[PDB]
Design a protein around this ligand. Sequence first.
Ligand SMILES: NC(=O)c1ccc[n+]([C@@H]2O[C@H](COP(=O)([O-])OP(=O)(O)OC[C@H]3O[C@@H](n4cnc5c(N)ncnc54)[C@H](O)[C@@H]3O)[C@@H](O)[C@H]2O)c1
Ligand SMILES: *[C@H](Cl)C(=O)NCCCCCCCCNC(=O)C(Cl)Cl
Lengths: 492, 492, 492, 492
Amino acid sequence: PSPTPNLEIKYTKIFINNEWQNSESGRVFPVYNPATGEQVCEVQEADKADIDKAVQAARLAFSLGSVWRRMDASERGRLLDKLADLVERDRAVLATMESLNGGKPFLQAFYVDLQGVIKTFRYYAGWADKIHGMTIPVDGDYFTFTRHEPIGVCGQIIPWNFPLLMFAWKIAPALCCGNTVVIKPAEQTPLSALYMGALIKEAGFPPGVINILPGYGPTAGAAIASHIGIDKIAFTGSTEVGKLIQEAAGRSNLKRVTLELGGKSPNIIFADADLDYAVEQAHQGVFFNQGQCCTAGSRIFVEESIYEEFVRRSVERAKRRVVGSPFDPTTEQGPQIDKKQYNKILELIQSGVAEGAKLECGGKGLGRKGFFIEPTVFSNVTDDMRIAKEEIFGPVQEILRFKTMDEVIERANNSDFGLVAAVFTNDINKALTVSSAMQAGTVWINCYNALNAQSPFGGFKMSGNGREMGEFGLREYSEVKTVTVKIPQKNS
Amino acid sequence: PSPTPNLEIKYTKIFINNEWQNSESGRVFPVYNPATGEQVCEVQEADKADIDKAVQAARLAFSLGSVWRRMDASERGRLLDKLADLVERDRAVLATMESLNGGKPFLQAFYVDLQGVIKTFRYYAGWADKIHGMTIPVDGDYFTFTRHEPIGVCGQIIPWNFPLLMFAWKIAPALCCGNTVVIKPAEQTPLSALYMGALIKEAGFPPGVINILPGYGPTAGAAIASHIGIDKIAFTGSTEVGKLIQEAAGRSNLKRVTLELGGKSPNIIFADADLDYAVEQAHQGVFFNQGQCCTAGSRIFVEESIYEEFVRRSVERAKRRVVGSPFDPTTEQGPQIDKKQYNKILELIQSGVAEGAKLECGGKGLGRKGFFIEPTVFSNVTDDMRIAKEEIFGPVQEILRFKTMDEVIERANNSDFGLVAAVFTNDINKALTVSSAMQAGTVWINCYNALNAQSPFGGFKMSGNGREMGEFGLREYSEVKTVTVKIPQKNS
Amino acid sequence: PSPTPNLEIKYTKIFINNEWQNSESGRVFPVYNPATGEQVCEVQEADKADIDKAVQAARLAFSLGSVWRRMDASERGRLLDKLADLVERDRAVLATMESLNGGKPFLQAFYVDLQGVIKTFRYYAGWADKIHGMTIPVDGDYFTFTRHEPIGVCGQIIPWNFPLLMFAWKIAPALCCGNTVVIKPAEQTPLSALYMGALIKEAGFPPGVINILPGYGPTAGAAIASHIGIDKIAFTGSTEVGKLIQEAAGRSNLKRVTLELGGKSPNIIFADADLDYAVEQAHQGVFFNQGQCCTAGSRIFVEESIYEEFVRRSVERAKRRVVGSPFDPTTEQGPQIDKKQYNKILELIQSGVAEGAKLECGGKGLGRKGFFIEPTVFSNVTDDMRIAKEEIFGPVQEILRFKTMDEVIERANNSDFGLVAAVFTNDINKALTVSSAMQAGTVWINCYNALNAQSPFGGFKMSGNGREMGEFGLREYSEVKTVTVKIPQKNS
Amino acid sequence: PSPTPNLEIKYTKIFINNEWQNSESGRVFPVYNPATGEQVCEVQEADKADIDKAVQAARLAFSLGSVWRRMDASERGRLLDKLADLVERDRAVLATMESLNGGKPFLQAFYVDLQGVIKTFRYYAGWADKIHGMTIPVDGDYFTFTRHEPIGVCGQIIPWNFPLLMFAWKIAPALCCGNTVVIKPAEQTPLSALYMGALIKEAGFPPGVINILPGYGPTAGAAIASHIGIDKIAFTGSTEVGKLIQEAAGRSNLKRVTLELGGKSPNIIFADADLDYAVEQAHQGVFFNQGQCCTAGSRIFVEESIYEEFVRRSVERAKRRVVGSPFDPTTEQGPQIDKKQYNKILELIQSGVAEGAKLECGGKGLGRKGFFIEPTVFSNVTDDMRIAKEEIFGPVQEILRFKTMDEVIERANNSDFGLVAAVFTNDINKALTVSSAMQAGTVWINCYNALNAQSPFGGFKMSGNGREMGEFGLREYSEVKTVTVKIPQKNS
Ligand SMILES: NC(=O)c1ccc[n+]([C@@H]2O[C@H](COP(=O)([O-])OP(=O)(O)OC[C@H]3O[C@@H](n4cnc5c(N)ncnc54)[C@H](O)[C@@H]3O)[C@@H](O)[C@H]2O)c1
Ligand SMILES: *[C@H](Cl)C(=O)NCCCCCCCCNC(=O)C(Cl)Cl
């Protein structure tokens, strides 16, 4: 596959009730190509007034007796499958847009992100008519059952590091369960979300079931978080804003909250691991998607006896990693998303030099247009360094050494985060002891970043709450109702 | 059974690490009998310094390799069953304490509250070794499974209207899942919870697994809600404090939050219901437990053709309702909990008279000592009256009229609350249509207040977040971990 | 839609390993049109040697490391969805074939049977990657989980009354779970099953995963039931043959057995039912599919006070029921399947007259070409009559009267069968009491023959064992393996 | 604990409807001590006439409106817990009976069998009120739910090798689900089951819910298997009789059937296993319970490089295994059950010698009284030998050698049985590849005979049908009913 030549950005308006609208204020905001710094287009800027219009449309679409509420659950599923068909048809267009707008190498957006999007919609297409309540053998002369209903209007806020994939992760389970949605893409990367609005219309979703509101965080995002007519919010982003979201839910209407936030995830390499394999997994585990990934394995603990060789191989690999234009097929790493993130990464790199970590390679920006940074490897990292504690979200690998299993379990768990973890060993007892002891929502054994539509994902500790993907991803998008019926005489 | 004669209050200290402790400040606080106003005893007053000690004890008991972590899940269940046996042995003592301290008629404390306590422990005793994760047929050469682990240190805050029962509702699922607990009873009603500490020690729970911290809201309660070493908080109480709890969770450490809060629940009586049964069920649905129940059916909608007869019968029932000493076996209604609640009820009664509802009977305090209120009935209630909107938590029945099913569904659902609802009709189509349309966590058909250990309970909208009881109550007290193992070759 | 003009039968051979094969013996057997008696075509006649070759192909396709075993579960689901797409593409052809071969009115095969086929494949397409095992908190220092594996080679035998729909009901869950299949359509109706083999190949199922073996019962069917290389058998047909199947499994290799067999199902009409609706539902409930349906409501019990009016309305409806050529859009009822069934029906009708049931209308064959029987209604049926006890499988309606709920529950359950039951009443207490007391696998309330892909179906008593459709339909097609791993130290 | 001095055998009669009855014929049968050959007592001999009375009693106890059918599910659970309490109270008496009657060393009966009995009853006590049906979001305007009802009268036939444990495994899930039971202990070992009747009466089960019918196979057992009034049969015993049971169910009334039958289970030892641990586990895995265990690891495959050392260590262990009086605390191995089993073992030992296996030690009877056999080890066993294919059920260990993982997987799976399997290795990849490839219902990794009340258990292939223990054990004892209600308008 090749990037779509001369990609037209057709959809730049607010999507409400299946109609393209200007912002109430008339304001628009610029969207950039992070690889060149040039403006790609302008987009209508949603603010609190547009959120209120979107919530009203989503609320009306959810009303008892509406098309969306009366629809067979199996037909909700068919609509998700139709949406997957349209994404597959437009796969190269959407991957080009993800590359252009988000800086991802086009072939990675096509084979990773877009494959994840399609598989997510197809997976949840299958769940819609398989969401079951229960019947319960309660005490007394009663018939008791549960109804698993949609919650209602779900507000969703997503970040710039996986714009389209996070859009799909959020709307697929919500729609699977029968909710309606007001979703706010990141101001950096609204474009593929807006294109999805055109596919949502083309697939035949009833108006108001999905409303897409491009805009800034403190305006549009905060309006969603505090809205008294939104029943549930899902947020993926920084831990700092996660706190604000949960606080705003409590101050407003006690909407249900799920969060996916930062990580500083440990990747533990025992001396019996295959080094060809573990070095490459650990390299991808921290450098994938320009380092802009919540799952980044940013604390690699390596057993002492293989530490020097592991560092040696990792440095050779980082020095070889190809940075360049996202449309070039040889590019492995594109730019960071913007100047703020670029500056944040360099400041943390500078703190690592100042705190005495060993800079093995990289450590500087490239002098090109856009926001490109050399693949950077630190060794001799220790637990109290800022780079060992703070999420970098950049192409910065950190390698630590350990001696014993009990020691590395303690150090791996000594974090306020707990998103993912990994252990590489062939010893069954160590693998299961370490994976059971990790305080993390996903633990990989002999792999890294193995995510699948079928398996739930989410944080321990301050990395978030709730799970996404899998069956358990549905639980955050339903409200349980118990119905208890007096009967004349109960028999088993 | 008879109230225990000359009940002495043996347990008045703070319970941490299975030992009885004085408050760090040295302060005690008085506990009163709401039927007489007399002081019953004094109890050690926990504050932030005591909460800090309790969290440390609970964290140590939760450490990997501890007695509580290593215990077979089936043996966690055995301990809950042993606790139930001890409650059963001491049922009269505990019911006497609930009557003396909480104002509940002794026979109701004995046959309702204590029965629910025993059944709750026995129910969750059976779940401990039946909490299952899953194995998942993910894409790719992987073996994927989930582990359902305890979260950690759970802080629990409970109110004064069901002191012992809410104690059991909170600690039983938490312990069943393997958590450790710091629990704060209401300052009005600490005594039965402290007695439970003695039984917890006698049953053999490891030290630090349950810690019981009597004290006030802004001191002990707020110290739990903002504690950075508490992983999860559960709260039952006012909507106003629930909002503060959820905000404090976001501001502090993003601890997981469940809430059970206010209600203004509708009870819908159709003309084809069994009338005398519906009158009695709706009477109990308002007046049970001195009206101090989150489930109170405080908006009774009666179809117009039976409205006058329903009111007349309801008024006759409320006039003969026996109000008196909780220890007297003829007493149906004890006092309200304290002067603050007493005054709140009286002011809402005045608002009902001022806004033109028809005071059919009652409406005043009874006697001079304690906090007794005449059973009160308002008819001709309309939806915009304060007594139709605000939770009263007193013995005040509100009766409204309606004409059509569509109308009453809309009016029932027009509420920021959504805790329970009921419909009385012999028509299967009406019953299913109304119960499916209610925006409430529990809907009763031809009954009211039918609560069972087996069935989940909780609020829609601002009545709460999450569910308690049943299998689903366990979901708030576990963390899901996904483990994904790379394998050489997958076969189905 | 309209019948495919001049339908040529393209597929007439045995389907093994995605190849079209002649019988090992060279023998063929004729296939007839039951509406004219004319021979439609000849089909290769499978016998024991052909079954043996098919089992070998299915076994090789199930080998560890094979394409079908290694495929992602989600990709097994995609293949079922592709098969559904192809059935939809060829819907009119397939409905024409079911009409020409089976006698079903074309419009019914198109809108009922073929819709069920498509919905069945699409439903199970969604389950394949959602079949989960469990992880278990066992006693001791162990990690225990379950794998739900396909059983292996499944033998399936289906009857002539729903040839294509039952073909789908059988193969869809078996393939969903990852099994391979040797399936034997009824000798009267092999044609649509053979066409499906072409679609199975076109969709891309690996060779040997589905093998289709047309032939006779005591030859091909018996060879499947006794085969020592078949792990599981599923049979739908007569109770008599079901007994032979279970016996043959015990005598041979103890293959797992599920059975769907006869019924004599009760349909209970209380005096408050809507007669316009209930008369039509009970009419369709006996007469659907020429009366050739296991779910037939062949014992209608009508409350005394509306019995005469119900009989009057039922007779009027039967007298207007249009019998004729299946291709005529106005036809409601086609012919019976063959002369043997035709003769069985008429002999039972004669038994009814001889035992004193009141023949209200019908009772004779129509005297044209083909096997057409007048729609027949008996009133004054009593429980001891042959027609009240024996499954007729023809267009014969039996109407009984009852007085009390206790009485009708006892008479309804006084059967060796227990496939289905129904109750028509608006009284919620009677509806739930009757439905709960029925000894039947499916109970309808205020409807009849409401079957859905999402709902499990199957018999109590001698109407069968196991369930089909829904999630539970999967349980008969997987084998549970428990894996228990010793670990150094368990923690919760 | 010590064996109970002066053990009186108090309960020797038939147990029907909670009454002790004489046999209808008047016959009694003798019961022997297999360590001495002496007669212990005589027991009333049930035959067809007694089965008939028991089925009538069980049917009446199951009728709608009976005490057992109306009981809260939670109270069925309380009765199982009470039965566990009484077994614990009488643990030493019951273990003395199992030792005296079954030949089990008393300490093994006390610490293994009786612990399993108690844990089984306590586990299923917790399931009774947690058996849930589902509510289902079907297509069309319907409300659909399932109820999981008890099947009815369950016949249960158990063997002599774990008399009390198998009695508990059978009646616990049946009663949990609400069935009634007619259970026939083995003629060799009726005593502990009859004692359980006294405890069942003492615990307070309603009359007729459990009926205990001591007697022989072709008389009492065949009467159960053929009974037209029994809904379900469960049988544990020989493969040959299991085939007869399944055939008899087909011939009689199509009762549902579960079977636990023979095994020839493989135990695979890789060179990288912990060798001394593996030797001891594999020794217990074949010699436990006098070798009379369906799970016996009677094909030990040892990787060639550790084969000679493994043989030498296994021979040393067998030569020191203490065979002697079951009441003696030094005894590890008691006698075989009776003269028939003794002779069958001796003949198979001769077969191994004749066919060229290396007799390393043992091979003859021990002493002159009772049925004691020397612990016997064969090495250089090959797959075609009779001792490698036929279940011995005696203290005969067989050791085989292998070279590759692919080879040992193929040889382990080349069997008509598939009850259990095990693999010993410290390599995670080999452990998971082998366990996934095994055609067996339980696979242990680095352990053997790790059985737990929480884990389901049962055979692949001819080792049986169905699963026992765990949640899945309940599925064989419930009947699923789908209830589908027409509703005016469906909303999600
Ligand atoms: N996958 C993730 O969890 C993820 C994604 C992006 C960034 N981060 C972390 O965040 C750091 C900073 O990046 P960022 O500033 O773009 O993250 P961010 O949290 O500010 O932005 C994520 C989303 O939150 C919206 N948002 C911002 N402020 C909001 C507010 N006050 N109220 C409601 N919504 C608001 C944003 O518009 C965007 O849609 C990064 O360095 C990284 O460490 C994590
Ligand atoms: C005995 Cl199994 C028998 O005759 N069964 C057929 C009953 C068919 C009822 C009408 C067809 C229903 C079509 N719908 C479906 O197949 C749904 Cl997908 Cl379950």
